[PDB]
Amino acid sequence: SQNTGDTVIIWGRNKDEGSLREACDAGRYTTVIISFLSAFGYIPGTYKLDISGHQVSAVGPDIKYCQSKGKLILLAIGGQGGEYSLPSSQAAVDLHDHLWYSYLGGRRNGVYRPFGDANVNGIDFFIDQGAREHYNELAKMLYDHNKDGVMVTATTRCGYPDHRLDEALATGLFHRIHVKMFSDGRCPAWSRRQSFEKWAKTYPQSRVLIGVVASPDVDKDAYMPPEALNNLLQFINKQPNFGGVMVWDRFYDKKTGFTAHL
C-alpha cells in the first residue's frame, strides 16, 4: 500500500473491541496506543485510567505477549475529556512520578500498577483538552530516563501549530507525532496534504504519522476511505520522516476492516 511506515491503532475506547492480545494477533498493527489516562493535575493525588471497562487484569499479560511478538505499546495521557491539565510544575512532577512508577519501568512497593509487572514502551501526549502549560517539563522528565527505553510521542490536532503541544514539541524530545485529520480542529479536506507536510517539515527529527478514522461513524467529515487515503499517501509518503498511519480505533477498524483494505 502507500503506507510505507508503521500502523498504529488506538485501543481502550470500547470494551467490545476485544482484548489487547487480539489486536496484536490481528496481523495489522505495529503499535497499540492504550487510551487514556484521562484524569490528572486538577486534584493532587487523583489519577484515573479510563479504558472503557476493559479488564485491567488482562492488559499486563497481553502487553508482555504483544512485546514478545515485536509490537510497541504506548499509554496515552489526556484524551477528549475535561478531567485533566497541569496547573503547576509540581503537577507535572507528580504526573511524571505516577507514570514512571505505575506504568513505565519504575518500581515502588505500594504503588498500584494496573498492568502489573508489564512496562509500556512509552507515553503518547494526547493533549486534546485542558491548558497547555508544563507538558514541556513532563516531556523532559520522561525523556530523561533514556539518558538515565521511554518513547515520547504526541497526538496533535490537524492544524499546525497545536498550541496544546507546541511548547512540548519545541523541546525536541518527541520521537513520533501523530497528526489527527479527524476530531475537533479537523482540517478541511482540501488542506490535508499541505497541513501534514507542514508538520512533517517542521519536525524533521521526528517520525510524523497521519491520524485517520476507520469509519465515518467516528467522524463523517474527516473519514477518507482506503482508496482516498492511499491517494493522499502517495504524496505525503515522500516526506523523508513520514512515519506511517495512526488509526482511530480498534473497535471501528474491526468493524470496517479499514487497515486490512489499505
Author numbering: 6 to 153, 159 to 272
What is the paper's account of this structure, in its own sentences?
Plants have evolved xylanase inhibitor proteins as part of their defense mechanisms against phytopathogens. The rice xylanase inhibitor protein (OsXIP) is structurally similar to GH18 chitinase and homologous to wheat XIP-type inhibitor (XIP-I), which inhibits both GH10 and GH11 xylanases. Various inhibition and interaction analyses showed that OsXIP competitively inhibits the hydrolytic activity of GH11 xylanase RXyn2, but not the activity of GH10 xylanase RXyn1 from Rhizopus oryzae. Although XIP-type inhibitors share significant sequence similarity with GH18 chitinases and adopt a (β/α)8-barrel fold, they are thought to be devoid of chitinase activity because of lack of the catalytic DxDxE motif, which is completely conserved in the catalytic domains of GH18 chitinases.
The OsXIP structure was refined to Rwork/Rfree of 16.6%/17.9% at a resolution of 1.30 Å and shown to adopt a (β/α)8-barrel fold, as observed in family GH18 chitinase structures. Electron density maps of the amino acid residues (Arg155-Val158) consisting of a part of the loop between α4 and β5 (Lα4β5OsXIP) were unobservable in the structure. Although OsXIP shares only 38.2% and 27.6% sequence identity, respectively, with XIP-I and hevamine, a GH18 chitinase from rubber tree Hevea brasiliensis, the main chain structure of OsXIP was closely similar to those of XIP-I and hevamine with RMSDs of 0.85 and 0.77 Å for the corresponding 260 and 253 Cα atoms, respectively. However, in the OsXIP structure, these amino acid residues were substituted, that is, Gln9→Arg18, Asn34→Ser43, Asn45→Asp55, Gly81→Gln85, Ile82→Gly86, Asp125→Phe131, Glu127→Asp133, Tyr183→Phe192, Ala224→Val228, and Trp255→Trp258, respectively, and the substitutions appeared to have caused the protein to lose binding ability of allosamidin. The catalytic signature motif, DxDxE, conserved in GH18 chitinases, was found in center of the groove of hevamine, but not in the structure of OsXIP. In most GH18 chitinases, three disulfide bonds (SS1, SS2, and SS3) are conserved; however, only the two disulfide bonds corresponding to SS1 and SS3 of hevamine are formed in the structure of OsXIP. In particular, the loop between α4 and β5 extruded from the opposite side of the DxDxE catalytic site in hevamine (Lα4β5hev, magenta) consisting of only four amino acid residues (Gly148-Val151), while the corresponding loop in OsXIP (Lα4β5OsXIP) was made of eight amino acid residues (Asp153-Val160) (brown). Although OsXIP possessed Arg155 at the corresponding position, electron density maps of the residues making up a part of Lα4β5OsXIP (Arg155-Val158) were not observed, indicating Lα4β5OsXIP being more conformationally flexible than Lα4β5XIP-I. Furthermore XIP-I has Lys234 in helix α7 (light green), which forms a salt bridge with the acid-base catalyst Glu131 and water-mediated hydrogen bond with the nucleophile Glu239 of XLNC, a GH10 xylanase from A. nidulans, to inhibit its catalytic activity.
